[PDB]
């Protein structure tokens, strides 16, 4: 099943000198119990697509065009009365360094309460302790010690565990995670990934997560979506991506993983057509005159590249 269809998503950042065209025309289908990874280098639009999808864009960011369908109904253009029932309950989002959203003069139990309260639902404080403890366990934490401690007393690994437990609180059907594992030593990064695998199996959920490390994606993901300068450049299954990477940018990555000449594109003044052309070794005239069309190819596979066709 497709649990989420992103259709033609244009979302930009309004800035003094014009617009920032991160997330520029973005269409992809999330399989209903999959793990999809969104991958790309620093400052390439990952968090921007995530935010656009969740209507969590800053005051700054504005959505120009497109739909996102959950259960065939468009999240953008939804009555906030109809949005509030979908939020933590169904779709849930632990965002880039949401640790910072943990005010540190507060016991964790309070960030749970704050969350629960905010999203409507009314639970007896003791009941809340129950549920919270339960998900804290799911994430392999000491419910007692943790709920009753202050953020500052927790490791980044533990803060991360807490954040996830928080997201799971209301048994969501989709869980979305942004750079879940960055700023986080090797080992504990490994433990988070393990944990993510555990919950993957132990729960019935669609899991979308963002990362800049392809390795991490292949550790975790079924399908993989590569983004380059505000564009969805390619979308295959993990194994296929490594086996048969289509976009020249992607190929480059995979090879560079067995160090690509060029600098990343200005997102204010991007290059024309295919933003990868200035670095692409297969660059052509049509590549500068025209944005390659997002296309379907063979099986799970999608590319946006002039080299290819139906
Ligand atoms: N509120 C904003 N206003 C203007 N520009 C922004 C805003 N937020 C992000 N950008 C810019 O748009 C580009 C894409 O940012 P985004 O956060 O989507 O990248 P990313 O893929 O998350 O990479 P990273 O997370 O490592 O920064 C970046 O250059 C970023 O600085
Ligand atoms: S579209 Fe043209 S430039 Fe962009 S990657 Fe495919 S070939 Fe290289
Ligand atoms: Mg990011």
UniProtKB/Swiss-Prot annotation:
Its EC number is 7.4.2.9. [4Fe-4S] cluster binds at residues 274, 280, 287, 305. It catalyses: a dipeptide(out) + ATP + H2O = a dipeptide(in) + ADP + phosphate + H(+). GO terms for molecular function: 4 iron, 4 sulfur cluster binding; ATP binding; ATP hydrolysis activity; metal ion binding. Its main location: membrane. It is a peripheral membrane protein. Part of the ABC transporter Dpp involved in dipeptide transport. Responsible for energy coupling to the transport system. This is Dipeptide transport ATP-binding protein DppD. It comes from Caldanaerobacter subterraneus subsp. tengcongensis (strain DSM 15242 / JCM 11007 / NBRC 100824 / MB4) (Thermoanaerobacter tengcongensis).
């Amino acid at each position: 099943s497709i649990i989420i269809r992103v259709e033609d998503l244009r979302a930009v950042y309004l800035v003094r000198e014009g617009t920032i065209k991160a997330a520029d025309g973005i269409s992809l289908d999330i399989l209903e119990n999959s793990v999809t990874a969104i991958v790309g280098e620093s400052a390439s639009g990952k968090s921007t697509i995530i935010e656009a999808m969740t209507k969590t864009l800053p005051p700054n960011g504005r959505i120009l065009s497109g739909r996102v369908l959950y259960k065939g109904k468009d999240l953008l253009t939804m009555r906030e009365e109809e949005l509030r029932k979908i939020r933590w309950k169904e779709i849930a989002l632990v965002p880039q360094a949401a640790q910072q959203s943990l005010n540190p003069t507060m016991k964790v139990i309070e960030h749970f309460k704050d969350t629960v309260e905010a999203h409507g639902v009314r639970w007896s404080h003791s009941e809340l302790i129950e549920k919270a403890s339960e998900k804290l366990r799911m994430v392999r934490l000491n419910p007692e010690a943790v709920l009753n401690s202050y953020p500052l007393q927790l490791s980044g690994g533990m803060k991360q565990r807490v954040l996830i437990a928080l997201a799971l609180l209301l048994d969501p059907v989709v869980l979305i995670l942004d750079e879940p594992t960055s700023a986080l030593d090797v080992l504990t990064q490994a433990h988070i990934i393990q944990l993510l695998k555990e919950l993957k199996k132990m729960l019935k959920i669609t899991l979308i997560f963002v990362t800049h490390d392809i390795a991490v994606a292949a550790e975790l993901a079924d399908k993989v979506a590569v983004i380059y300068g505000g564009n969805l450049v390619e979308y295959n299954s993990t194994f296929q991506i490594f086996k048969n990477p289509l976009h020249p940018y992607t190929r480059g990555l995979i090879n560079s993983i067995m160090p690509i000449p060029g600098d990343p594109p200005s997102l204010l003044n991007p290059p024309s057509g295919c933003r990868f052309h200035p670095r692409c070794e297969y660059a052509m005239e049509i590549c500068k005159k025209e944005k390659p069309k997002w296309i379907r190819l063979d099986g799970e596979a999608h590319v946006a590249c002039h080299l290819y066709e139906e």
